[PDB]
Amino acid sequence: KNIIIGAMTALITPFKNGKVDEQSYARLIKRQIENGIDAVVPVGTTGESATLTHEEARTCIEIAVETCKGTKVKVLAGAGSNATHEAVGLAKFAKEHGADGILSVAPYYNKPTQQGLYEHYKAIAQSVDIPVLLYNVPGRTGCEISTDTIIKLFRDCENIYGVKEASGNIDKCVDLLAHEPRMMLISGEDAINYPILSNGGKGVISVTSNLLPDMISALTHFALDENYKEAKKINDELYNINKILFCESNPIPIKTAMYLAGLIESLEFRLPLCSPSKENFAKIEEVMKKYKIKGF
Amino acid sequence: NIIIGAMTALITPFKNGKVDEQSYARLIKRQIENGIDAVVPVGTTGESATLTHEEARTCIEIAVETCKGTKVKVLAGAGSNATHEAVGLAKFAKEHGADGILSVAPYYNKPTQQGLYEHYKAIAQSVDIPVLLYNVPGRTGCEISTDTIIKLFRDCENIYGVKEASGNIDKCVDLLAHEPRMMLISGEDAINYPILSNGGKGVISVTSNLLPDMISALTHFALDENYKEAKKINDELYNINKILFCESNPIPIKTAMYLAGLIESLEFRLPLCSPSKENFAKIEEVMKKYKIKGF
Ligand SMILES: N[C@@H](CCCC[NH3+])C(=O)O
Ligand SMILES: N[C@@H](CCCC[NH3+])C(=O)O
Ligand SMILES: [Mg+2]
């Protein structure tokens, strides 16, 4: 199979006066590239995919593809939807606009059955020729992609090569790689990046990497080089910022951190997302001071 | 200014991948003719997530014109997890003859209480028809707290209550004990009577798609404070109320409607699919204990 692995960043989408700051987005992507990142995930959950227009989503995917031209960094475009015809369309666009692959979150709100999830992803896989990474996050979707469904999808569709797990369930990641050791298991939860990597995972899709791309990039490469002591050490040091970046729902804290770090101008969200509480604002600032944030 | 009583979350029938518009209108007239007080087009039961904005509009219009000339009101589904999308949906609804909007809490992106407050204020201050909140944390990933609902009720005149689908009777005490003027609407058919018996003023029912007369009688008995007859119907409906969630709504109800000959094809839009063979037979079993009205 063709795969997209390693240290990857779920890119934030900066806003200036309610519009996508295109120069900032492009500017943030280059900062990721220059810090050892292997792939970028535009218009994911951290990128506020739910509140972006279909026209803004295509702009941000094009900025990513165009900023990584001439580099080793791949673009894993977010193209999920809880409507299958909608997800197929997004996957088709992302392919035709130069993305190296698609990240496709499990359907949210409507809670499809395991059979429905199978047909949903099969339709998506039959929609493009680029690699397809599943994304399982039950805390947001209301549903779980079972291990059986993932493995059946892995064996029945050539594009489906692994899963981004954000379920806090190390048991499931043992289950996956013990029955299908060929899949690419990707960490979607920064705090347990090393434990996921140490069991055979081949990359991360990180929130923290928005702020400390070099440290997440270092964590992954130590792990992939089987330097588990160096990987766990970085994992251990990052635990505090990894948890505090979820004091409120992602991406409220990470954008707050970027703003405090002077990496984006203005702390702008799209409703129903909004600035954090005063308490959370101050707590974020406290945790940040214990870490060295790279500039541009 | 409210919309209460027995209401149906209409299923959305498909024929060859398209919305069977004549079957949709014929199902609405069957609800009207069986004592239902309002219809909820393109809600969760109507597969709102997988319909296009153009189809959503079509079913809202079919509902308004099929209920034109009747006392039956239209509570159109117009929620979204993007506020600008929810505002736009509310405006159309208004522009299109709907008597009000049902606005589900934002799903997937998990906004804070402050974000949910501003989300609903934006919707409410943008249109003038009544707005019923819809709280179903099992699907959205978020809960509209009791404080937030009450604040919305008190700060916006358009927001008049909440449809609760959280299986949390404690919260329904919490709501009506601190704000007894709001309209609490049950979103869980199995506990329709307990919610009504605490001061609830209506239901938005899945079961009413198949047995509209039974849900209609249950609600009106309760609103008439005939709780013994209301509970009696609620108890008789438990089996079908429960089996109708053997898989996620509306997979079972469409199976029931199809089995009963009320729709002609068992068609879903993906990622929704027909149920397992096992659940198909169980739904078929439970139906046999109920008298299903035709057209
Ligand atoms: N807000 C809707 C539509 C998203 C359209 C692309 N950003 C959803 O999350 O499914
Ligand atoms: N299926 C997407 C698109 C919106 C159309 C129906 N609300 C969503 O649930 O947000
Ligand atoms: Mg309270």
What determination technique applies here? Answer: X-ray
Which domains are present in chain B?
5-235 (3.20.20.70)
Facing A50 at nearest CB: one of B47, B50, B82: B82
Chain A touched by B22 (CB under 8 Å): no
Residue of chain A whose Cα is closest to the Cα of B276 = A115
| Cα A115 versus chain centre, distance | 25
Determine the Cα angle at B52 with ends B47 and B58, to 5°: 85
Q: Which residues, 6+ apart, have CB-to-CB distance to B144 below 8 Å? A: B105, B116, B133, B135, B162
CA distance A176 to A156: 16
CA distance B77 to B55: 12
* Contact yes or no for A51 and B107 at CB 8 A: no
Torsion sign, CA atoms A143, A144, A145, A148: negative
Closest listed ligand to the CA of A83: 2
CA distance B100 to B197: 25
Contact residues on chain A for B47, CB-CB shorter than 8 A: 110
Torsion sign, CA atoms B187, B191, B193, B199: negative
Closest listed ligand to the CA of B173: 3
Q: Indicate the helix (H) or strand (E) that contains A132.
A: strand A132-136
CB B259 within 8 A of CB B284: yes
CB B208 within 8 A of CB B43: no
CA distance A219 to A101: 23
A46 annotated to bind ligand? yes
Chain A touched by B114 (CB under 8 Å): yes
Determine the Cα angle at B148 with ends B147 and B153, to 5°: 100
* Contact yes or no for B114 and A50 at CB 8 A: no
**Residue whose structure tokens are 């959370």:** A280
Chain B touched by A123 (CB under 8 Å): yes
CB B168 within 8 A of CB B176: no
CA distance A116 to B250: 13
CA distance A217 to A213: 6
In ligand 1, the atom with minimum distance to the C-alpha of A57 is 7
Helix boundaries (H) for chain A: 22-33, 54-67, 84-96, 114-125, 138-141, 147-156, 170-179, 193-198, 213-224, 228-244, 252-260, 278-288
> Distance (Å) from the C-alpha of residue B44 to the closest C-alpha of chain A?
8
State the number of CA atoms in the 13 A half-sphere of A83 facing the CB: 13
Q: Indicate the helix (H) or strand (E) that contains A30.
A: helix A22-33
**Residue whose structure tokens are 């509140």:** A51
CA distance B101 to B3: 10
